[PDB]
Design an enzyme around this catalytic site. Structure first.
Site, PDB file in Angstrom:
ATOM      1  CB  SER A  47      44.912  86.174  -5.922  1.00 24.39           C
ATOM      2  OG  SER A  47      45.330  87.513  -6.126  1.00 24.39           O
ATOM      3  CG  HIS A  82      47.934  94.294  -4.918  1.00 26.71           C
ATOM      4  ND1 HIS A  82      47.833  93.529  -6.060  1.00 26.71           N
ATOM      5  CD2 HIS A  82      47.162  95.386  -5.134  1.00 26.71           C
ATOM      6  CE1 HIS A  82      47.078  94.156  -6.942  1.00 26.71           C
ATOM      7  NE2 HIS A  82      46.661  95.288  -6.408  1.00 26.71           N
ATOM      8  CG  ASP A  92      49.497  89.904  -5.491  1.00 26.25           C
ATOM      9  OD1 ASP A  92      49.029  91.000  -5.855  1.00 26.25           O
ATOM     10  OD2 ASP A  92      49.422  89.494  -4.322  1.00 26.25           O
TER      11      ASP A  92
HETATM   12  C1  B12 Z   1      46.953  99.685  -2.669  1.00 27.36           C
HETATM   13  C2  B12 Z   1      46.383  98.951  -4.075  1.00 27.36           C
HETATM   14  C3  B12 Z   1      47.275  98.764  -5.083  1.00 27.36           C
HETATM   15  C4  B12 Z   1      48.804  98.676  -4.839  1.00 27.36           C
HETATM   16  C5  B12 Z   1      49.220  97.449  -4.137  1.00 27.36           C
HETATM   17  C6  B12 Z   1      50.535  97.589  -3.443  1.00 27.36           C
HETATM   18  C7  B12 Z   1      50.625  96.710  -2.438  1.00 27.36           C
HETATM   19  N1  B12 Z   1      51.729  96.269  -2.276  1.00 27.36           N
HETATM   20  O1  B12 Z   1      49.620  96.376  -1.758  1.00 27.36           O
HETATM   21  C8  B12 Z   1      49.333  98.886  -6.198  1.00 27.36           C
HETATM   22  C9  B12 Z   1      49.212 100.396  -6.493  1.00 27.36           C
HETATM   23  C10 B12 Z   1      50.828  98.448  -6.546  1.00 27.36           C
HETATM   24  C11 B12 Z   1      48.188  98.191  -7.025  1.00 27.36           C
HETATM   25  C12 B12 Z   1      48.360  97.525  -8.197  1.00 27.36           C
HETATM   26  C13 B12 Z   1      47.350  97.066  -8.960  1.00 27.36           C
HETATM   27  N2  B12 Z   1      46.013  97.133  -8.749  1.00 27.36           N
HETATM   28 CO1  B12 Z   1      45.301  97.574  -6.918  1.00 27.36          CO
HETATM   29  N3  B12 Z   1      44.558  97.969  -5.202  1.00 27.36           N
HETATM   30  C14 B12 Z   1      45.069  98.590  -4.228  1.00 27.36           C
HETATM   31  C15 B12 Z   1      43.833  98.787  -3.302  1.00 27.36           C
HETATM   32  C16 B12 Z   1      43.505 100.305  -3.219  1.00 27.36           C
HETATM   33  C17 B12 Z   1      44.047  98.507  -1.834  1.00 27.36           C
HETATM   34  C18 B12 Z   1      44.429  97.121  -1.491  1.00 27.36           C
HETATM   35  C19 B12 Z   1      44.578  96.899   0.057  1.00 27.36           C
HETATM   36  O2  B12 Z   1      45.758  97.053   0.452  1.00 27.36           O
HETATM   37  N4  B12 Z   1      43.573  96.392   0.788  1.00 27.36           N
HETATM   38  C20 B12 Z   1      43.729  96.329   2.216  1.00 27.36           C
HETATM   39  C21 B12 Z   1      44.302  95.025   2.789  1.00 27.36           C
HETATM   40  C22 B12 Z   1      44.632  95.307   4.253  1.00 27.36           C
HETATM   41  O3  B12 Z   1      43.101  94.259   2.728  1.00 27.36           O
HETATM   42  P1  B12 Z   1      43.029  92.872   1.951  1.00 27.36           P
HETATM   43  O4  B12 Z   1      44.019  92.792   0.787  1.00 27.36           O
HETATM   44  O5  B12 Z   1      41.567  92.516   1.560  1.00 27.36           O
HETATM   45  O6  B12 Z   1      43.514  92.007   3.212  1.00 27.36           O
HETATM   46  C23 B12 Z   1      42.392  91.422   4.273  1.00 27.36           C
HETATM   47  C24 B12 Z   1      41.755  90.070   3.840  1.00 27.36           C
HETATM   48  O7  B12 Z   1      41.729  90.241   2.407  1.00 27.36           O
HETATM   49  C25 B12 Z   1      42.714  88.978   4.381  1.00 27.36           C
HETATM   50  N5  B12 Z   1      43.734  88.276   3.512  1.00 27.36           N
HETATM   51  C26 B12 Z   1      44.332  88.675   2.372  1.00 27.36           C
HETATM   52  N6  B12 Z   1      45.165  87.760   1.845  1.00 27.36           N
HETATM   53  C27 B12 Z   1      44.948  86.635   2.587  1.00 27.36           C
HETATM   54  C28 B12 Z   1      45.497  85.279   2.419  1.00 27.36           C
HETATM   55  C29 B12 Z   1      45.076  84.227   3.346  1.00 27.36           C
HETATM   56  C30 B12 Z   1      45.665  82.964   3.206  1.00 27.36           C
HETATM   57  C31 B12 Z   1      44.091  84.506   4.406  1.00 27.36           C
HETATM   58  C32 B12 Z   1      43.364  83.341   5.189  1.00 27.36           C
HETATM   59  C33 B12 Z   1      43.553  85.885   4.581  1.00 27.36           C
HETATM   60  C34 B12 Z   1      44.015  86.933   3.665  1.00 27.36           C
HETATM   61  O8  B12 Z   1      43.362  89.735   5.498  1.00 27.36           O
HETATM   62  C35 B12 Z   1      43.144  91.157   5.567  1.00 27.36           C
HETATM   63  C36 B12 Z   1      42.368  91.453   6.703  1.00 27.36           C
HETATM   64  O9  B12 Z   1      43.228  91.463   7.632  1.00 27.36           O
HETATM   65  C37 B12 Z   1      42.836  97.859  -3.935  1.00 27.36           C
HETATM   66  C38 B12 Z   1      41.446  98.253  -3.665  1.00 27.36           C
HETATM   67  C39 B12 Z   1      40.653  97.309  -2.831  1.00 27.36           C
HETATM   68  N7  B12 Z   1      39.526  96.948  -3.186  1.00 27.36           N
HETATM   69  O10 B12 Z   1      41.208  96.957  -1.770  1.00 27.36           O
HETATM   70  C40 B12 Z   1      43.145  97.774  -5.383  1.00 27.36           C
HETATM   71  C41 B12 Z   1      42.792  96.769  -6.391  1.00 27.36           C
HETATM   72  C42 B12 Z   1      43.146  95.348  -5.685  1.00 27.36           C
HETATM   73  N8  B12 Z   1      43.555  97.016  -7.508  1.00 27.36           N
HETATM   74  C43 B12 Z   1      43.146  96.853  -8.662  1.00 27.36           C
HETATM   75  C44 B12 Z   1      43.837  96.885  -9.797  1.00 27.36           C
HETATM   76  C45 B12 Z   1      42.846  97.314 -10.949  1.00 27.36           C
HETATM   77  C46 B12 Z   1      45.203  96.980  -9.774  1.00 27.36           C
HETATM   78  C47 B12 Z   1      46.228  96.988 -10.896  1.00 27.36           C
HETATM   79  C48 B12 Z   1      45.591  96.101 -11.987  1.00 27.36           C
HETATM   80  C49 B12 Z   1      46.344  98.521 -11.357  1.00 27.36           C
HETATM   81  C50 B12 Z   1      47.454  98.826 -12.477  1.00 27.36           C
HETATM   82  N9  B12 Z   1      48.708  98.696 -12.193  1.00 27.36           N
HETATM   83  O11 B12 Z   1      46.819  99.147 -13.542  1.00 27.36           O
HETATM   84  C51 B12 Z   1      47.530  96.501 -10.286  1.00 27.36           C
HETATM   85  C52 B12 Z   1      47.845  95.087 -10.246  1.00 27.36           C
HETATM   86  C53 B12 Z   1      49.247  94.919 -10.543  1.00 27.36           C
HETATM   87  C54 B12 Z   1      49.605  93.472 -10.336  1.00 27.36           C
HETATM   88  N10 B12 Z   1      50.496  92.978 -11.023  1.00 27.36           N
HETATM   89  O12 B12 Z   1      49.037  92.810  -9.459  1.00 27.36           O
HETATM   90  C55 B12 Z   1      41.699  96.282  -8.544  1.00 27.36           C
HETATM   91  C56 B12 Z   1      41.603  94.870  -9.000  1.00 27.36           C
HETATM   92  C57 B12 Z   1      40.217  94.524  -9.466  1.00 27.36           C
HETATM   93  C58 B12 Z   1      40.185  93.169 -10.227  1.00 27.36           C
HETATM   94  N11 B12 Z   1      39.118  92.598 -10.074  1.00 27.36           N
HETATM   95  O13 B12 Z   1      41.178  92.720 -10.923  1.00 27.36           O
HETATM   96  C59 B12 Z   1      41.370  96.570  -7.118  1.00 27.36           C
HETATM   97  C60 B12 Z   1      40.475  95.580  -6.239  1.00 27.36           C
HETATM   98  C61 B12 Z   1      40.591  97.892  -7.108  1.00 27.36           C
HETATM   99  C62 B12 Z   1      39.627  98.159  -8.091  1.00 27.36           C
HETATM  100  N12 B12 Z   1      38.483  98.194  -7.626  1.00 27.36           N
HETATM  101  O14 B12 Z   1      40.003  98.369  -9.306  1.00 27.36           O
HETATM  102  N13 B12 Z   1      47.052  98.390  -6.352  1.00 27.36           N
END
Ligand code: B12
Ligand SMILES: [Zn+2]
Length: 841
Positions: free
Chosen positions: A774, A723, A721
């Site tokens: 993940s 993110h 990961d």
């Molecule tokens: C910002 C982002 C980035 C950032 C992340 C930085 C960072 N530190 O967060 C950066 C630019 C570094 C990045 C990197 C990458 N990313 Co990105 N990222 C995003 C993006 C736009 C937003 C993510 C976000 O912050 N969501 C908002 C948070 C608040 O929401 P959340 O994670 O869902 O959290 C909620 C719930 O999920 C829950 N929660 C989460 N974790 C847990 C754990 C437990 C225990 C519990 C109960 C609840 C819980 O709580 C929150 C609600 O409060 C997403 C798009 C998307 N669909 O979201 C892609 C996305 C995740 N990325 C993607 C990809 C393609 C990549 C990269 C492969 C791109 C690259 N470098 O070529 C890399 C991965 C690198 C790696 N080694 O992991 C894809 C992955 C798709 C896949 N199926 O593999 C995504 C989904 C987008 C897409 N549609 O292409 N990215």
């Protein structure tokens, strides 16, 4: 079928001996056995004087049913034989201890592993220069091969550059006897998540894919219960066969002898687990084990059918510290070219005096920028680039956290850079600029020196302008590149000139069309390949605003037409979602030169003369947008001038929680939706992350915490990961409510997390993820946490996480879940704390 040790490993699981430490420490050799007063205490001095004593330790594991035995070779290297002048004739010793190991093993048929140590001096920390280690390994290893070992083990390696020079030295040692073998590097590990040098478990394997070595493995690790994570990621992930040799836990010195406490029964359990569950093809534990350990493993675990590993490692590249995946297909890989003195002049100001401390800043600042492979070129008039490159890499090779690309001109740097860089890189030597001869050697150097190339559509003729000659680049090179020169599609980029369109000539005006139709016509048959374009150069010979906008709409149609990487400076593109509707219509029909009604080029320029204040510090039309759109747009472009004031305006209108329930979940999510649709690129998503990261630090202090002593709770991300956006808030509502907390970092592999269980003994542990892979890692945690008998509350979540591949996990572990939002995370903490009504079922 070609080699007996691969017939063994592919068929069934076999056992490595214990080492001779705890074993020579039990023979009481007395100083006359060293043959000279000055040769005190030296194993590999004994091999000369007392062959019968080491033959006694050899045969002890053979009597105890071992199936692989190390030669003595812990000291087989000039700079460690000469450590007190203890005999310069490595070859001899190497043919001596290989003969002593054969004299013992011959009746038993157990495999002779020519089995070195790492030597006393390291390449990567600058303790020594590559020639002086490469020389020592080169002269030594041919005596082991002459000794007739079944294979060489370069085992216990401490640094990937120490692996590279050892593999190059062992290859040039074997090849100058007319042979090669299934040689076996194996690596040390430390609980920091890494080898001793700082190399992580991904960088190790991503590097080690680049090599023909059919076996890889682990050695001198700190016991199976600490090796399990590492053995995991290697066994399930690798193509090359994996083997295992823990040193029986941790030492304790008694009377000058190192002794342990892990038992022969416990080592029978741990191989019985690893060999059929994970698929470990050979097993043992060496330092600190008697012949009884290897007997009790051999009876319980020997002869089991060795399990298969998968047909492909991902598209990858590797620095010292970390891997990167080469194919993104979303947030395309960005390549940094600012380290350039020949296609740019920034580099030339800092690097002129030999100021290496300055060139490293120019390298690292591009990763913060967003680019995660860097492209390097120090070539200039009146300066020798190949001598400069000695100095350049001496700082870059151990400073930079991300892989390398090489725009430097002479293919002699193709060799010298691959003699000063760790890991796996790429090189821009395939410029087909001196013709097919130069290209086939460039493609050979690419791999004779490990792994390093990019295809570039420059050529002996020049810059392909017509596409038939451009696809004839791929026809000339690629097929013979992968299928005669070893680097996969998933190991290469591919690059198209990105020449100027905007000079306004009827030669130049169409040319971005040539690149998009070619790019497409090329992904048409290049799956897995990271297409990489020098976006900055399509808009050349015109006013700078038309550079941002034409470069932007070129790049942001290029993904839709097939792009996955780009050579970029983030200051010289913007996202296609920002562009004014007329300017986007203009920019497309300018990229095509699809002219009607007016000319697209002078229409463009006159558009920027009419619309000057729009793509600037706009004092009106941008300010007049509703703050949710304005924040959406700040998250899209990465706009920060006044970002503090618009978040202060949002915080003046509504409470943080209402704002994070609002745009600070929703508008980001919309940016994520647009990003998944391709309306954005990596540095803009990094500007979005940086916007969030900043915003949470302004929201948290106003959303101030309450209560004390509520419990002990730690949080943890997962392996692979990057993110931790979700993570931060997943934590935060728990951190706000009086519980004592410890935070684990963005990429934590599991044995660090479990050491935090074992050390902290919390009431709860966070697990987490923001991307698909993940989920796969969640199951890897839960299946083994159960095999270790853990019962701690571990909570599970992620953008991707979904009840369909999660409720079934309730079967594997008594604590499966999905808080989705951190407010449920708090309600669930209070349940598992006993404060609230446990309903989780
Ligand atoms: C910002 C982002 C980035 C950032 C992340 C930085 C960072 N530190 O967060 C950066 C630019 C570094 C990045 C990197 C990458 N990313 Co990105 N990222 C995003 C993006 C736009 C937003 C993510 C976000 O912050 N969501 C908002 C948070 C608040 O929401 P959340 O994670 O869902 O959290 C909620 C719930 O999920 C829950 N929660 C989460 N974790 C847990 C754990 C437990 C225990 C519990 C109960 C609840 C819980 O709580 C929150 C609600 O409060 C997403 C798009 C998307 N669909 O979201 C892609 C996305 C995740 N990325 C993607 C990809 C393609 C990549 C990269 C492969 C791109 C690259 N470098 O070529 C890399 C991965 C690198 C790696 N080694 O992991 C894809 C992955 C798709 C896949 N199926 O593999 C995504 C989904 C987008 C897409 N549609 O292409 N990215
Ligand atoms: Zn060892």
């Amino acid at each position: 079928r070609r080699f007996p040790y691969l017939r063994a490993l592919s068929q069934r699981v076999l056992v490595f001996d214990g080492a001779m430490g705890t074993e020579l420490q039990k023979r009481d050799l007395t100083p006359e056995d060293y043959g000279e007063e000055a040769y005190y205490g030296c194993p590999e001095v004994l091999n000369r004087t007392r062959p019968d004593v080491v033959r006694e330790i050899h045969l002890s594991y053979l009597e105890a049913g071992a199936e692989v035995i190390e030669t003595n070779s812990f000291g087989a290297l000039r700079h460690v034989l000469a450590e007190y002048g203890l005999g310069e004739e490595a070859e001899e010793l190497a043919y001596r201890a290989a003969r002593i190991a054969k004299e013992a093993a011959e009746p038993y048929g157990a495999f002779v592993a020519g089995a070195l140590g790492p030597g006393t001096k390291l390449v990567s920390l600058g303790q020594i220069s590559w020639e002086e280690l490469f020389s020592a390994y080169k002269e030594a290893v041919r005596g082991l091969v002459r000794g007739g070992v079944d294979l060489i083990l370069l085992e216990t390696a401490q640094d990937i550059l120490q692996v590279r020079c050892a593999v190059l030295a062992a290859r040039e040692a074997m090849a100058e006897l007319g042979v090669e073998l299934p040689l076996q590097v194996q690596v040390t590990f430390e609980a920091t998540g890494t080898m001793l040098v700082g190399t992580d478990e991904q960088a190790a394997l991503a590097a080690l894919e680049s090599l023909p070595i059919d076996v890889v493995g682990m050695n001198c690790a700190t016991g199976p219960d600490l090796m399990d994570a590492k053995i995991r990621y290697f066994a399930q992930e690798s193509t090359r066969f994996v083997a295992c040799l823990p040193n029986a836990g941790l030492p304790r010195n008694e009377g000058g002898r190192v002794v342990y406490d892990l038992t022969p029964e416990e080592l029978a359990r741990w191989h019985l687990k690893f060999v059929t569950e994970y698929g470990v093809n050979a097993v043992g534990g060496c330092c600190g084990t008697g012949p009884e350990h290897i007997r009790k493993v051999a009876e319980a675990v020997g002869g089991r059918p060795s399990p298969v590993h998968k047909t492909a490692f991902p598209p990858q590249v590797a620095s010292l510290y970390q891997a990167v995946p080469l194919r993104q297909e979303t947030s395309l890989l960005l390549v940094g070219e600012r380290l350039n003195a020949t296609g740019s002049k920034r580099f030339r100001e800092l690097l002129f005096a030999g100021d290496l401390e300055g060139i490293l800043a120019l390298a690292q600042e591009q990763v913060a920028e967003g680019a995660h492979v860097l492209d390097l070129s120090v070539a200039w008039t009146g300066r020798d680039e190949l001598e400069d490159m000695k100095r350049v890499l001496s700082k870059l090779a151990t400073g930079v956290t991300v892989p390398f690309m090489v725009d430097s001109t002479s293919p002699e740097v193709m060799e010298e850079a691959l003699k000063r860089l760790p890991g796996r890189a790429i090189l821009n030597s395939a410029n087909l600029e001196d013709g097919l001869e130069k290209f086939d050697r460039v493609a050979s150097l690419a791999k004779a020196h490990g792994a390093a190339l990019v295809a570039l559509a420059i050529d002996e003729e020049g810059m392909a302008k017509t596409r038939v000659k451009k696809v004839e680049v791929a026809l000339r090179m690629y097929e013979r590149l992968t299928e005669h020169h070893g680097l996969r599609p998933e190991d290469l980029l591919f690059d198209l000139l990105t020449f100027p369109i905007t000079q306004g000539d009827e030669e130049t005006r169409p040319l971005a069309r040539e690149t998009l139709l070619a790019l497409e016509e090329l992904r048409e048959r290049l799956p897995g390949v990271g297409f990489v374009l020098g976006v900055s150069n399509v808009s050349f010979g015109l006013k700078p605003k038309a550079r941002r906008v034409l470069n932007s709409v070129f790049l942001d149609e290029a993904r839709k037409k097939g792009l996955t990487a780009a050579i970029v400076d983030a200051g010289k593109i913007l996202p296609i979602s920002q562009i004014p509707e007329e300017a986007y219509a203009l920019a497309l029909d300018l990229i095509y030169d699809r002219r009607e009604g007016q000319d697209p080029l002078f229409a463009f320029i006159r558009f920027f003369e009419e619309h000057k204040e729009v793509l600037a510090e706009d004092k009106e039309a941008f300010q007049a947008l509703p703050v949710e759109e304005r924040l959406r747009r700040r998250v899209l472009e990465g706009k920060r001038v006044g970002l503090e004031e618009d978040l202060a305006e949002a915080l003046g209108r509504m409470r943080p929680l209402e704002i994070i329930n609002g745009p600070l979940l929703e508008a980001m999510k919309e940016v994520g939706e647009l990003f998944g649709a391709g309306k954005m690129q990596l540095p803009f998503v990094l500007q979005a992350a940086e916007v969030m990261k900043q915003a949470v630090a302004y929201l948290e202090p106003h959303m101030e915490k309450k209560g004390e002593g509520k419990g002990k709770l730690v949080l943890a991300t997962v392996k692979g990961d990057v993110h931790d956006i979700g993570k931060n808030l997943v934590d935060i509502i728990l951190t706000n409510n009086g519980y004592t907390v410890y935070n684990l970092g963005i990429k934590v592999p599991i044995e660090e997390m479990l050491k935090a269980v074992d050390e902290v003994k919390p009431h709860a542990l966070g697990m987490s993820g923001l991307l698909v892979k993940s989920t796969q890692v969640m199951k890897e945690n839960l299946e083994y946490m159960r095999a270790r008998g853990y019962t701690l509350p571990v909570i599970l979540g992620g953008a991707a996480l979904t009840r369909a591949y999660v409720e079934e996990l309730r079967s594997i572990y008594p604590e499966v879940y999905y808080a989705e939002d951190a407010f449920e995370g708090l309600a669930l903490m209070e349940e598992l704390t006993g404060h609230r009504p446990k309903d989780l079922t």
